[PDB]
Amino acid sequence: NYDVLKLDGTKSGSIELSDAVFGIEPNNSVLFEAINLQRASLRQGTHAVKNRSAVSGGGRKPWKQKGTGRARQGTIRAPQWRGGGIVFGPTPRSYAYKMPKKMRRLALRSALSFKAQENGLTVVDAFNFEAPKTKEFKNVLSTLEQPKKVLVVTENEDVNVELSARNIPGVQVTTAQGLNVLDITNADSLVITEAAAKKVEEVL
Amino acid sequence: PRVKGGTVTRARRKKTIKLAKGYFGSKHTLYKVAKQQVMKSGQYAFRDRRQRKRDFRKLWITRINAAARQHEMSYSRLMNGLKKAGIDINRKMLSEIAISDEKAFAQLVTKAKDAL
Amino acid sequence: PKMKTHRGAAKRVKRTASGQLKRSRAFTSHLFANKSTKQKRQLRKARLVSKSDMKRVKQLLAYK
């Protein structure tokens, strides 16, 4: 059982949230794998170098194999040469990988349960924003007594909430479907509407 | 990402060179020959910590021999007599006594002779 | 790319329940006048690929 507050901070009511979603013992191994996986998936991987084939020129043998007194050499673009080709080095590639779906769901539930146990979970009756107003959203956060880093969860895309929170440092807005381990874990507190909480509970 | 050679190389070589302070010419100046010499220095120092114990026992024995001969006794018989007398003073101490107070050493010599 | 099965070995073995490789027997092609009745009778019986050979060849049959 969790309190449901109004934007002014008073108790609108109470809500029941399944402990199978918000009440599990977080699985830190799975949560770590999920965080690492998401961070890897964000990488662009656009990095490259020119190996000895790729560097310009270098076709001919710089000097005859024997007789000159110099080390034998086969191309001015060999790797030990200044300006030569790079041995191995970066080559474009993806870093993304997968984990089983059950583990994805377990990771999300573990992050949400960690918030619930750390008392960084606040349930609000609704966001009744008709026009975007960053100042009003800042006041709402202060009245709810929120920390610097807040993840705001709506049931569906809420344009005015998104636009009002967008410019506040440390405030991220998402939907119930858009929840992810990195965002939840980065946040210090979660502010979720009752409808969004019910949707999350259904999904997980 | 690329990791350029950076500063570590110079720091490490400079340490070896500083260890080579006082060596002759290039050996206090050039990393390669300083490194070699510092390697030799370490090996020599390891060996000589052990050789030093031998050398100092040798010195003590020589001095004890001289003192015993001044009392008409060889080192060998003096040590045997001290053993039979049950006196456990080691060679370093015997030498220092013989140097520093001759009357005490003469008393030790008489103990040895009586035991023999 | 995918590793390739060694097709000759695949034509010459079969994998058993415990993962061993059943094999047939050499000296069973011709010149039977030069091998005793007992020799031929017993060469009729299949064997397994030895442990020492398996160390060498196992990757050739990974998909088998």
Add this chain to the structure above:
Amino acid sequence: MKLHELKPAEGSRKERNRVGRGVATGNGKTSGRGHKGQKARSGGGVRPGFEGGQLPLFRRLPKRGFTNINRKEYAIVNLDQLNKFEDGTEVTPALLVESGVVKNEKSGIKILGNGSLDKKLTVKAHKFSASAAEAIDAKGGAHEV
């Protein structure tokens, strides 16, 4: 967990070993290859199964058999697996697939006699072992191909 306090599961991670980075590693210089020969060379080493010119095993041994173009193989179900359906159930290939007893039907469902049947069922399958049919009948049930 916090992003500034991440910790992988114990024993899940190990640092890769890097060769050719000095003698103290124990893999400096020759980088674990020993000295010389074919196996010390970039790209060196013989084909797997090569035996240095001794006739290889898979040439000294002969080929055997053929593959049947019309080969049939059946998805098998044992009686112990049938034991999950309520007595009186009409077990069919569709029910087996839906219940998840059979995943791939292959050439059809064959019932085999491993384990003990503890329920009365009407079993429809493409084939039955003699023992499987006998057990299904003896438990009071029926079977049909």
Add this chain to the structure above:
RNA sequence: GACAAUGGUAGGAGAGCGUUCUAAGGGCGUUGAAGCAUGAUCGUAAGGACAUGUGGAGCGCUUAGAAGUGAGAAUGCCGGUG
């Protein structure tokens, strides 16, 4: 507390040092960052501090992640200078 082991080439195994970058947290900096230089400093090693001079704007630290991650030798390549 006891008492047992600890030479080592190829090679196997383990634990670590340091480099660049990233994430998060927490810091430093024109009242002087990095770099460089010197010193009689500390750690079992790789190595880590501190002070002073130079320098003039950037840089540590913690945990995790990722690698163009460590050179004394290749009649190595380029530069400088004997």
Add this chain to the structure above:
RNA sequence: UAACUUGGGAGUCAGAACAUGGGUGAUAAGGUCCGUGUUCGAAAGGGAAACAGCCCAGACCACCAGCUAAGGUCCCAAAAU
């Protein structure tokens, strides 16, 4: 106080002297080929003037402590003129 089984990873396939049982050679070779042991290889320390392979002996680190091994004790040079 080991041994064996299974599985992951190897390197090695130029060996040397010495002693001894033998072939070969000439009861030649620091020769050559086998058997057996040790040492070197991969082993520092003490002795054999110097001297991988001989003799003593296997260095975790420190000591300006003691007892010994081979080998030594007139001086070089520790210890018996």
Add this chain to the structure above:
RNA sequence: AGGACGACAUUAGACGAAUCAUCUGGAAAGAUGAAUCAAAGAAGGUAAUAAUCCUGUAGUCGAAAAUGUUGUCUCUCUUGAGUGGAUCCUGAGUACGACGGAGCACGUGAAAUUCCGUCGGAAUCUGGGAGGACCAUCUCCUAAGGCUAAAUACUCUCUAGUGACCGAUAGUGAACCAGUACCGUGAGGGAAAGGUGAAAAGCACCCCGGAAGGGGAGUGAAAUAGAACCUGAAACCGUGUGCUUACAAGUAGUCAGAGCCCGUUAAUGGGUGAUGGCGUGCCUUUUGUAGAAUGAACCGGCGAGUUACGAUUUGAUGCAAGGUUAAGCAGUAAAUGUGGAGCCGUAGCGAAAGCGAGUCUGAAUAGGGCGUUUAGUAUUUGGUCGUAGACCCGAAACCAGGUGAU
């Protein structure tokens, strides 16, 4: 083939919120204090690090003219079905065959299916082709004429962006007047080389000198930033000096040690070293190297087991008689949702038909082989292997197309 009107977009642009004070300092954006905007806290600049100083950003607005994509009118073109089975038509040097080649994953093979050269060469709906030689039956098609968007490939280019990509020996060969200089008859080969300062305020004037160069003075926070002018390591070259050295045999140190000179991260200190003991560099390669075997003049920088996809094993984790999705679609180039086709496992044995906790062999209920009498599977760290140049450098050569008889 056109025409009229309209819409949208591209090719310039316009508006666009909100900060002051003190301290340090050459300078404030820094620190301190107190405020303010935010649908704008992207970013760059400004005398150091700025949401509120500038350029901008979110948001909103804008086109005389040209171009592009589109909608509606116009314009243009244009019949559409059924019944009958008498006759007619339905692609010929074609299909096909033989021989010789080629192409099919398929190397001539039992070789279908498909093309080329040479020679031969059909049938006509009761026809013809195909189902991997071939025949029959059945089934599916209807060759020897043509056209056809999209889903797919690629990037010289333009616009807007992105990066656990480089940061001047790197990154393009080229950050710079570089395919330049230079080399070659020619094809062709092919560099080196970035940094004053915030502002040029870029040193008036005096002095030595022919000049170069310098000493002052001045500018500047700094000239010790004065022109390849941020920093300024090492090799190397000099000047001064504390200790030391002209009877001594030296891999240059090490251990012992007086004398002399100092005085530190203040530690049972630092520099030097009369004299004694001990002691033939390093790497490579070797049975064995002080080796008179190899390599390195010195210093600096650069310079060698990587990544992708498969395999296997180990560790980790989730689920478990189950485990797991691929492409695709949605999403922010994300996590993720969805997607069960597919894959592995739950049963083996046999060459196979097949039988099945058994099966194969066997005449055998014998004996024997492989099995049964639970655990897998997905992702991933590590190790190793395979395919790739596969740890790095090095041939003599081979082939192809060009350039040369100055």
